[PDB]
Amino acid sequence: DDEEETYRLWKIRKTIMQLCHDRGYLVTQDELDQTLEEFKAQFGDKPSEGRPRRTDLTVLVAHNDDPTDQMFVFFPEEPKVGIKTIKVYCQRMQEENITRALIVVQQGMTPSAKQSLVDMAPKYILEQFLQQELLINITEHELVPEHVVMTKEEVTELLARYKLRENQLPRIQAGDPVARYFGIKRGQVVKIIRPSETAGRYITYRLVQ
Amino acid sequence: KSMESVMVKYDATVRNSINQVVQLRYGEDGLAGESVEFQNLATLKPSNKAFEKKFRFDYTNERALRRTLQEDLVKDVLSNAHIQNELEREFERMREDREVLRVIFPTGDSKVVLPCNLLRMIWNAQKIFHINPRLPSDLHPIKVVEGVKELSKKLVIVNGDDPLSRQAQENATLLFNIHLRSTLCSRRMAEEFRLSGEAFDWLLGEIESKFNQAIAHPGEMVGALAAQSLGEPATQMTLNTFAKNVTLGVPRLKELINISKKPKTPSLTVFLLGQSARDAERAKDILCRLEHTTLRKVTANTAIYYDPNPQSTVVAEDQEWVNVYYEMPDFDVARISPWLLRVELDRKHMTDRKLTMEQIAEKINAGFGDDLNCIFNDDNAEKLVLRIRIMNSKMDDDVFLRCIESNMLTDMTLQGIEQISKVYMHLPQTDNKKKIIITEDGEFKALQEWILETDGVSLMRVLSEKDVDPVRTTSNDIVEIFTVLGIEAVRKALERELYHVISFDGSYVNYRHLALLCDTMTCRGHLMAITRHGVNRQDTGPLMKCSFEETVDVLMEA
Amino acid sequence: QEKMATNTVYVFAKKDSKYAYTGECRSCLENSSRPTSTIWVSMLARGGQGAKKSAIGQRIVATLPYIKQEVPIIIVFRALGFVSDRDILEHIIYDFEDPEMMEMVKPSLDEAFVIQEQNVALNFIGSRGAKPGVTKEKRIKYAKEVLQKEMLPHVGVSDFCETKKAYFLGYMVHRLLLAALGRRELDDRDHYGNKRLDLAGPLLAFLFRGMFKNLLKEVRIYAQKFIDRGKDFNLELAIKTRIISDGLKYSLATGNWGDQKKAHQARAGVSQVLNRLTFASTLSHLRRLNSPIGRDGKLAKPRQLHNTLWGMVCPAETPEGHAVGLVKNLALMAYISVGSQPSPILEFLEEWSMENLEEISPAAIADATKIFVNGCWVGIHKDPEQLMNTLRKLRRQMDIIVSEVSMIRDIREREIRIYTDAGRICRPLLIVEKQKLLLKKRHIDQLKEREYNNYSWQDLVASGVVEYIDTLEEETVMLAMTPDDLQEKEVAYCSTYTHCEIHPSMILGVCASIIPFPDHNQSPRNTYQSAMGKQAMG
Amino acid sequence: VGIRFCQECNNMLYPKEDKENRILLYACRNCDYQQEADNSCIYVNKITHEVDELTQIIADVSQDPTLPRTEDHPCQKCGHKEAVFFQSHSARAEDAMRLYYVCTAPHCGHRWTE
Amino acid sequence: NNELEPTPGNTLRQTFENQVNRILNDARDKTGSSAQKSLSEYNNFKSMVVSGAKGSKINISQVIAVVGQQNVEGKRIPFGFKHRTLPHFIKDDYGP
Amino acid sequence: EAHKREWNLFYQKQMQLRKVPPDENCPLKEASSRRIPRLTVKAREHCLRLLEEALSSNRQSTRTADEADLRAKAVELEHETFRNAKVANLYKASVLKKVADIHRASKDGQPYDM
Amino acid sequence: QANQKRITTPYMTKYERARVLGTRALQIAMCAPVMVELEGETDPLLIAMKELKARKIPIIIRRYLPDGSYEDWGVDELIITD
DNA sequence: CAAGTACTTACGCCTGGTCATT
RNA sequence: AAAGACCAGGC
DNA sequence: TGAAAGTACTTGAGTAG
Ligand SMILES: [Zn+2]
Ligand SMILES: [Zn+2]
């Protein structure tokens, strides 16, 4: 029906707020814990021909360390995202000189849209997320351990202590769901803290290739 | 041949032939498996009141203190507040460590593998130094505290003053340190074991010596050992696994090793969150939201009739409600198509799935647009009938309706998640699948909840479903866990599946061997099958690949 | 050497093939010529061909010999001169009053709606052959030759036999449709009634046919190269005796069954060396059966002990290792049929009522039983019970039917199969009439005086007391294990016993009969002893 | 439900609509034969296949030695005590274990399920 | 007589097979328990079972009480012949 | 997945080739709406008249108040049925279910409460 | 690496003990001087074990850390497991 | 970018005899 | 005598 | 009669003035 779509939109917003928080962006506690009833009351309820048109759901966040870069999570209405919508999104980003962005597709993006999304890679990093992938926080799963994005100083210390070339570390594909969750590019190292029935804790580090 | 060259280097890091780090410490703790033994945590299980009563070291009693300690030690403990603060600090540390155990060990399984046997060594200390439990001891509790701290500093797996190495050390012996603090507690050493000073020092010495002997020996070819230790149980396991049917034994080991994309029984265990966990009806309702029920699972029989005019009603028992529908301003005035598809739906399947004819009409209209007529009985009748015409007003309507009916009965997706053949529903008897919680009194308790085992695997859709627990709904196909969750998730899942296939017969393989196999797969960033595609795909040498199933091909490529 | 029983229709179901149900028939012309020229009739799964299949799985197709791809069955039927779809259906469906089978066969007709003449159908078959003919005439001639000679040669290879071939092809399609509707069980794979054993007879015949073909080929070559000159020709010089002598010698010696030049493609492991360590070993080697399936197969089913091995193959004796269940040993009473030409049975059936397939209206075949002799469909019969009683009487008295000929009445399927084929495995069972043995005291009295009385086993069999029962007649036989406990009236379990076993200790073979009290052991220990006895010393 | 054949070429009749008369006509495609139809049902898809097995059973199975027989259940037509009983022996038997009885004695052939 | 409701998750035939296997396995277990409880303290079978040197409780149960259900492919002895396991039985005999 | 799009294209290609304000006093809430496609205002009037004769029967069987407030009651019922249905056939089915429920309530003898 | 900053196990591994015993035994069999006094033992393995216990083996084990650097540990410095 | 095909691999060790080709 | 194939067998 | 699964390859294929 349509309350299913509102439940989906609320859960997507919850997961995206957790995703923005985990990357270190400034999100309020209420944004992280907002009930479905509260979301309907604030955003009108019924999405079809209603107050939430899947626009105005976009969330702008700023990083704790420097409030200049920010990050704008979009919400396209077209089930098949095309060149035009990502183009207008990039224009809006530029007018506010914001750098990183997400695009929460409904079903998928056209191949030309994907090529254009990877085209402006150093200028404006825009990532793509299917709506289905955002209905659960994969990091909240019991099998998924705690991933922490290591800084360059920490990675330098890591390779100094163990005397490792960066390619001797275990790897993790950039398209892995957790790596995509933290938006890790090639080169960064992710610290993985997991419990063990033989040691208690084993901190691994995986390099993104 | 997958892990033949994997060994423990002299920096106590497990590395393959290309100096790639597989495990930072061998078996995540750095100790060889010959010396470890089963022990009980003794702090994970007991309740808050029991934990306090067993470890607190109540120094205020002044009566049991003299019954447990020598005369002078009681006066020292009562008078000196520094000793009291040290004792309270010890207990608070035990409480923190107990919470760490609870998060590390949910399900409350205190049976752990640790290097040196604390209980046996305390018994030996009692017997060697002729401890008389009936008489008070002569050991300062602060001596126990300081001694366990000194031993903690002296038991080192990852050395160096570096904060990184310091944290690695604290992790590598955390389980053993909680075990030592719990077993060597001041209260337990003054009340239960009642050791003496010399016996306590000897106990510290032997703990240190046995722990040092346990540390992995650099040069130990861990990979070959792990491969053989997973192959030896594979010989004795039955090739057959035989109402859920999950493949076990050599076939399941083969599916796990070869990361097969088409397992015989791709299953998905689903845990329900809210009231659906404790209620049969809501559990069945969620199951109806998961299993795939096309129109064939609900249709009794479908037949195409010739109905030149709707008023004719060529089916005799279908007049009344029809003339209720066509006495309205409908499109009958135009050339309504004559051919009719009459589908009778079975009542039993309708009431088993809580479906109604209204919802089937909605599905038909959604999947075929408003340009296809679908008027139904509106139930409350002895026969569930839906009469569908193709109103448009050459592909004559008979053949087109045959194709439409075949499509509806095959792929109409009336309800549920596709590629999910059958979803069961049962209350578990074994404790692993129950809902383990921590009571208010701090005690581990198991609550029986409804769970659903599903044949077919669609992990993302089930996890996204409302009233399905995302933190516990897992699957058993390695590839789908890798695709949905990640590479670490697939590591842990593969460990669990290997553990299942090995331990289904009660057999035990030490965790480090499974850990090394699961790491040698999920280390290069992708699920690397233990097969010619993955042992011969890595960045090893041509001569190592040339010994495993390709020979001339690898040499020609090189 | 085992082989699937030729001249029979077996409806199987592949696990994941593009065919759902496949009826195969291995056809040999009374072992007179050719090894076997099989025919398949499959049903093309459930997935359609775009715009024709929109039901539960249809479009019967036929895989003929020497045709590169499949041919729809209706085209094959029309190629035999049956243009009308009513005639084709009459050959396929025996009673049109059953709409389900018609609904099952209709899309196969819809596939072949385009082709509507005999010549165009034959062209359709021919153009898909090994090499399409340049002209229509060559394609037609090749298609006719494939249809008559190689496709189903056991039913007939002499010209006008097209009607008989049509009836048998319809029978295969009817078995296929029965399996598709579910009215028939899919034929058991390892069912031993579906297996024939080639003893030294058929095997040496198989080699001798090849070597004689070679001797004739060489003599024709010699004569042809000597006749261009036109002087004369001598047979003694032209005949190379080495062909027969050395071919037989090599095949028996090396074990590779066939020509020397084709050793790799030849069957191996036949004609082993008689191991003479122990007498029991010699006997076990002389009485041994070898399933030709590769020993490296991981499928457990072809190695398991089938229920049908009861009294034919020792349940215990089988070599351990990767050849377990595939090398078997005969039970004590097992006898392998040597062969008998089925001329008298056909003559008797024709004289004693029976209506041949040529002179019967197809509508009369629904309610009549179908008499098969050596697998070829010889006709239909109206009163089947009388026929079975009369045939059994003849076989018991051994006048027209020899004792090794099997007669089966599939009652639920209105079929009667008579087998005179060599290779069937049978055991002698005592005959039970009413609820008492025909083995009276007089027979034992004459056998106790076996000397100076000229009473032997053959007199016992010719007196209608004992009867050979092969594996697929054992299905229609209710057997009493022992008389003294089962024939007698009690709380009744079965009051219709048709045969009784002489002694249930004859299920065990030669090497397993030395076991004392074998019923008390665990069966694997009996297998280990069966292996060990051949290695004993004496 | 079944197949209706043409009267001239005996090839299959496919369903058709008579536009001028508005009536179901089974029309032939090998020829021009057209026939008025009375069933008004081109196709029937009994997916539940609630087929009674009594029509398939043949009375000659009564004279099968291997089948079991009871004197407890007499025949409803002739009252003969002995009756040979057997299970479905066919499809849909994986969820059906009902027994079918065929009466004995020649010429009765009655069959029923209990 | 069709008085057995199909257990959820299984068809009627599988439910009946489960009932038969349960009854026969319960019988084997109880008979084996009785045989074990009837062993003299001097029994050599019991001495080797308690010693664990070579043996199992089921071995005593089979050598004294009952050998038990024989399974092929995990189900009971399949109907190799036409609806009968051996010629000596009547068709559709599902008895033990 | 290929079969889905193939059948969709087939159905679209085989079906494509096959292809007023309330007068004065219509008793409907937001009658000038088109949330349900191909639902003519005359169809709404006819469904309202079926509901109104149902309410008249309920009055004759349970003695409701009067027609003056039955007008507003019918307005509310039809508006609720409008908001609970999407396609025209669904609207007809929902009004049929509601009139069947009204008939059930009238036959029970109890007044048609909310 | 240099003599300082030895970051490895102070204990002598079983492989190190095995190979040091084997090499010292071969040296002794090849008329090498024996560092410890011998109580009339003629088995080179037995003399080697006597020397190892007495901590008088003239062998330095070069342990190659995976980065390529090496640590040289004298046999006398390491603590024997047995 | 799917549908089609072909290729490679399928326990370890051990004992004897036989035969054809050299 | 040699390595190639096959066969049977032992654990 | 009664081998079979992962990874290749190997083809044809595929919105405005
Ligand atoms: Zn015609
Ligand atoms: Zn009767």
Side-chain angles (χ1 to χ4, degrees), chain C residues 12 56 62 130 225 243 252 324 357 384 399 414 528:
Chain C
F12 291 130
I56 54 184
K225 71 183 299 180
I243 293 183
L252 297 192
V324 60
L357 292 183
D399 51 2
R414 269 195 283 254
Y528 291 0

Tab-separated table of all heavy atoms in Angstrom, chain C residues 12 56 62 130 225 243 252 324 357 384 399 414 528:
chain	number	residue	atom	x	y	z
C	12	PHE	N	12.575	-43.056	-18.065
C	12	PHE	CA	13.416	-42.488	-17.029
C	12	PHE	C	13.117	-41.005	-16.877
C	12	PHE	O	12.389	-40.405	-17.679
C	12	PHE	CB	14.882	-42.706	-17.374
C	12	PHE	CG	15.316	-44.123	-17.299
C	12	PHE	CD1	15.996	-44.698	-18.344
C	12	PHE	CD2	15.057	-44.880	-16.183
C	12	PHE	CE1	16.401	-46.002	-18.282
C	12	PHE	CE2	15.465	-46.188	-16.117
C	12	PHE	CZ	16.134	-46.749	-17.168
C	56	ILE	N	1.868	-27.278	-18.446
C	56	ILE	CA	2.697	-27.908	-17.417
C	56	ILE	C	3.912	-28.637	-17.966
C	56	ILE	O	4.641	-29.268	-17.188
C	56	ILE	CB	1.856	-28.892	-16.580
C	56	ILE	CG1	1.160	-29.906	-17.491
C	56	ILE	CG2	0.840	-28.138	-15.736
C	56	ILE	CD1	0.242	-30.860	-16.760
C	62	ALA	N	11.291	-36.656	-30.508
C	62	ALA	CA	11.877	-37.968	-30.739
C	62	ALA	C	13.311	-37.829	-31.209
C	62	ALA	O	13.591	-37.124	-32.182
C	62	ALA	CB	11.078	-38.757	-31.770
C	130	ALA	N	22.962	-36.722	-40.938
C	130	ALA	CA	24.404	-36.522	-40.823
C	130	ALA	C	24.913	-35.553	-41.882
C	130	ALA	O	25.726	-34.670	-41.588
C	130	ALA	CB	25.130	-37.862	-40.928
C	225	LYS	N	41.138	-57.202	-56.132
C	225	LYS	CA	42.441	-56.857	-56.686
C	225	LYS	C	42.955	-57.934	-57.624
C	225	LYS	O	43.856	-57.663	-58.423
C	225	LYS	CB	43.455	-56.602	-55.569
C	225	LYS	CG	43.884	-57.840	-54.805
C	225	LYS	CD	44.838	-57.492	-53.675
C	225	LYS	CE	46.107	-56.845	-54.202
C	225	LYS	NZ	47.050	-56.498	-53.104
C	243	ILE	N	42.871	-64.016	-39.065
C	243	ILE	CA	41.872	-63.070	-38.575
C	243	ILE	C	41.088	-63.682	-37.425
C	243	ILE	O	41.181	-63.226	-36.279
C	243	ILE	CB	40.947	-62.618	-39.713
C	243	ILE	CG1	41.730	-61.789	-40.726
C	243	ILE	CG2	39.798	-61.813	-39.159
C	243	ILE	CD1	40.892	-61.241	-41.849
C	252	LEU	N	40.582	-63.085	-25.835
C	252	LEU	CA	40.517	-63.884	-24.621
C	252	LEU	C	41.749	-63.682	-23.752
C	252	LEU	O	41.657	-63.776	-22.524
C	252	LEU	CB	40.357	-65.358	-24.959
C	252	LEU	CG	39.089	-65.771	-25.691
C	252	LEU	CD1	38.969	-67.260	-25.681
C	252	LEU	CD2	37.876	-65.132	-25.072
C	324	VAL	N	33.006	-52.187	-5.439
C	324	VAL	CA	32.040	-52.792	-4.536
C	324	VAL	C	30.644	-52.619	-5.113
C	324	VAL	O	30.254	-51.517	-5.518
C	324	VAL	CB	32.148	-52.196	-3.124
C	324	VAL	CG1	31.903	-50.708	-3.133
C	324	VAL	CG2	31.191	-52.885	-2.191
C	357	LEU	N	-1.429	-56.925	-34.883
C	357	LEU	CA	-1.608	-55.485	-34.932
C	357	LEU	C	-2.075	-55.000	-36.292
C	357	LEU	O	-2.612	-53.892	-36.389
C	357	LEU	CB	-0.310	-54.787	-34.559
C	357	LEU	CG	0.089	-54.965	-33.106
C	357	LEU	CD1	1.354	-54.188	-32.815
C	357	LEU	CD2	-1.044	-54.524	-32.204
C	384	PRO	N	-7.043	-62.455	-21.272
C	384	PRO	CA	-5.631	-62.615	-20.914
C	384	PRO	C	-5.389	-63.686	-19.868
C	384	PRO	O	-4.360	-64.372	-19.903
C	384	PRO	CB	-5.247	-61.230	-20.380
C	384	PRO	CG	-6.397	-60.334	-20.704
C	384	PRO	CD	-7.592	-61.207	-20.735
C	399	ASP	N	6.423	-78.346	-23.739
C	399	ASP	CA	6.091	-78.817	-25.077
C	399	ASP	C	6.368	-77.768	-26.146
C	399	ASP	O	7.179	-77.996	-27.046
C	399	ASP	CB	4.628	-79.271	-25.133
C	399	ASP	CG	3.682	-78.241	-24.583
C	399	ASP	OD1	4.154	-77.157	-24.194
C	399	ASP	OD2	2.465	-78.514	-24.542
C	414	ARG	N	-2.305	-54.117	-18.212
C	414	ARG	CA	-2.856	-54.878	-19.324
C	414	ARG	C	-1.791	-55.192	-20.364
C	414	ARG	O	-1.962	-54.955	-21.560
C	414	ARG	CB	-4.032	-54.146	-19.952
C	414	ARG	CG	-5.359	-54.522	-19.350
C	414	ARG	CD	-6.495	-54.072	-20.232
C	414	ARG	NE	-6.733	-52.641	-20.115
C	414	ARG	CZ	-7.755	-52.114	-19.462
C	414	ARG	NH1	-8.665	-52.875	-18.878
C	414	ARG	NH2	-7.873	-50.793	-19.400
C	528	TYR	N	33.325	-59.701	4.259
C	528	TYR	CA	34.757	-59.876	4.467
C	528	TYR	C	35.148	-61.338	4.349
C	528	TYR	O	36.185	-61.664	3.772
C	528	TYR	CB	35.182	-59.315	5.819
C	528	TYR	CG	35.110	-57.815	5.916
C	528	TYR	CD1	34.694	-57.053	4.848
C	528	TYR	CD2	35.459	-57.165	7.080
C	528	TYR	CE1	34.621	-55.691	4.935
C	528	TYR	CE2	35.394	-55.803	7.178
C	528	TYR	CZ	34.973	-55.068	6.103
C	528	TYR	OH	34.906	-53.696	6.193
